[PDB]
Amino acid sequence: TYQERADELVVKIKDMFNALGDGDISPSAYDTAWVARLATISSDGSEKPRFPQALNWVFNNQLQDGSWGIESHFSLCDRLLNTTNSVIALSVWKTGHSQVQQGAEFIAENLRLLNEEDELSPDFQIIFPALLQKAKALGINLPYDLPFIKYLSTTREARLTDVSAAADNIPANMLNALEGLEEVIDWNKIMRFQSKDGSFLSSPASTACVLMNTGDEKCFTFLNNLLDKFGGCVPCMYSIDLLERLSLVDNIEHLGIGRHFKQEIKGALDYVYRHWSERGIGWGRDSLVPDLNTTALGLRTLRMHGYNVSSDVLNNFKDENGRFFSSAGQTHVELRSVVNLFRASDLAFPDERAMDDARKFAEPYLREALATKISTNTKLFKEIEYVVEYPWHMSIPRLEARSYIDSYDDNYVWQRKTLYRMPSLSNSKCLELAKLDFNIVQSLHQEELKLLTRWWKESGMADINFTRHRVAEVYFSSATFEPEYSATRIAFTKIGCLQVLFDDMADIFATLDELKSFTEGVKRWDTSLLHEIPECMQTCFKVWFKLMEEVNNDVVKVQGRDMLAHIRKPWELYFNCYVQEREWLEAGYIPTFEEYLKTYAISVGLGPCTLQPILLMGELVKDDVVEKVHYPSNMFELVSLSWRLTNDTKTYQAEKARGQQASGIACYMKDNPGATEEDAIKHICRVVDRALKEASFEYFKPSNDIPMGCKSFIFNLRLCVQIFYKFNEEIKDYIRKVYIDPIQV
Ligand SMILES: C=C1CC[C@H]2C(C)(C)CCC[C@]2(C)[C@H]1CCN(C)CCOP(=O)(O)OP(=O)(O)O
Ligand SMILES: C=C1CC[C@H]2C(C)(C)CCC[C@]2(C)[C@H]1CCN(C)CCOP(=O)(O)OP(=O)(O)O
Ligand SMILES: [Mg+2]
Ligand SMILES: [Mg+2]
Ligand SMILES: [Mg+2]
């Protein structure tokens, strides 16, 4: 059964968290072969392998086709690098004759397939011809003079002269390709690039090359310890203790299953936070040179989990021209790093210039990549498309999870100088659990919708012709999906349906007098004025009043005491704003921007759909805390502001055509003669953008008295308006994906 399989996967993933160390990463043939080339001198003066275990690994790990590499993941550049270095290692030590022969055959066959249109792997044009030069000196028979191969050698020779002609020798941005630049390196000057663990850019191949030329003891210790840890081989990079923790957390949260791992996540993030630095971070705690990907992932993930981190860490990766780079130790810019840069920018607080710069660079870069470089029919296209089309402030949690389940690749191989696996980060258990859990939670939502449809009938809403499908749309907008908040979602959906009903009532039907009558009835919180309004409005009031009774009875159970006095206020405020709107409309009055917002930021309706539902979540809301989490707290007011203004930009045109003059647009223009509608819309969008960032700041802001679950419900109500009233797919598609179609498991 689903629940049983999910339960054991949760146990298995928790074990993974508990077992986190320096990182789970595959052996690297290219790196292990470089380590295998290293010599030591015996007592008698003869040369022998310094690391015989590494040589033996090479000896024993040739693939069936004669190459070395990752068997199920063939890539031409990877296989050529792995195989050529492996044949070099065996040849140097006069061993593995048969493997050398078959290796040379593979290389010769595949050099004939390397062409000018093949996408070459990072620094391949430097590190590969360096291997060919060595192979040729060892007398290995390969077609070195094929046109494109000669071209690679010539390009490398130009790079060599650039370094030798450089006053300061090898520049930082060539560090990634150190071992391909051996014959021109200044071995004294290069040592300034060494990490505290003795490695060079965490790369065992590069570290072996430095060791070969210098004898440096710290290089030896890094390699010796790494071989011991891996049982006689090495990976392409180590350690990866920061990247692995951050990405495991990020992936789990993104997949929609983070609620199962709260304690494990806190543990992983506490570890990373200890190693967090104003200069950014690299894959591992000992990196001298940090990288954009790990730093951006760090900024986003730590911030998302309430840690205090500064966006200024991003300035470490920005050049004079406002462009970002992945690492000072390389020349190529990695697409994944730019994706994570954009995702980190989603969590900007107000006036964080580094986030502004990050997004201004990353967004065009990603859109350019989607339009020019990425194949439409891939998980990567879908993933990045979602990143830019549904960014954080318009990302509904279940939609985000559902999309990522389809774009998460659980059989992925990473590319740096060569290919490698990180089994914690491309993980079939994580994906399987995400699918099972989504289905289980979905069944819960389906039952909630079943109860809501039953209520739709029994309450009388069906009788008064409330649209059945509107129920599901309000329900979807609740956003806070976790199983423990069923009662809150159900109450929110009932109240939202009445608010939809009320708004239509106030427009299409009610006169001002009838509106005032209805409102006085709300203020009295009784049925004493039902007689003053039309039968249809009476029915509306009665459905609402009955709901209030049922909901308030439930609030007494959860909160431990009567909270009617609190609960009455938002309903009074809401209806009073309705009368104010109508008074202005009949008087043809256009308020100032400030005066407009004072009324319309309330009338948009965040008050009623939040107070009663957040009181059913479970957290204690003390009398003095109501105003700190609900109206008029800053976060609440900011969400309200985003609601009203975003709605205005989307709908003010249609409203004007119906005789409604007051809007954010019209009122700003009245305050500001000379400002066009376009100017007002631009200003309003800036106000909304800032309000969303400010709400984010307020949300993550630590407090000793404000309940975070309640804050989360209010904060995540910002999403529905951003997604529906944004200045492709529609609501029916969202509901299908989230509530109707299960995921094939
Ligand atoms: C795209 C939408 C889904 C989510 C929904 C809520 C957020 C649940 C509140 C009602 C409006 C809406 C925004 C909704 C807009 C629907 N849009 C066609 C609204 C266009 O005008 P309308 O006369 O209101 O259409 P009707 O509502 O179907 O009669
Ligand atoms: C802004 C809203 C999003 C969230 C939504 C739920 C909470 C999901 C259900 C109740 C209605 C509403 C509050 C909803 C109200 C939107 N509106 C119908 C009400 C207010 O907007 P309006 O300018 O007076 O009319 P509109 O332009 O045609 O919409
Ligand atoms: Mg074999
Ligand atoms: Mg209206
Ligand atoms: Mg509107």
Swiss-Prot record:
This is Taxadiene synthase. Its cofactor is Mg(2+). Mg(2+) 2 binds at residues 503, 507. It comes from Taxus brevifolia (Pacific yew). The gene is TDC1. It comes from the Eukaryota. GO terms for molecular function: magnesium ion binding; taxadiene synthase activity; terpene synthase activity. It catalyses: (2E,6E,10E)-geranylgeranyl diphosphate = taxa-4(5),11(12)-diene + diphosphate. Its EC number is 4.2.3.17. Mg(2+) 3 binds at residues 647, 651, 655. Mg(2+) 1 binds at residues 503, 507. Keywords: Lyase, Magnesium, Metal-binding, Taxol biosynthesis. PANTHER family: (E,E)-GERANYLLINALOOL SYNTHASE, ENT-COPALYL DIPHOSPHATE SYNTHASE, CHLOROPLASTIC. Binds 3 Mg(2+) ions per subunit. Catalyzes the cyclization of the ubiquitous isoprenoid intermediate geranylgeranyl diphosphate to taxa-4,11-diene, the parent olefin with a taxane skeleton. One of its GO terms (biological process) is paclitaxel biosynthetic process.
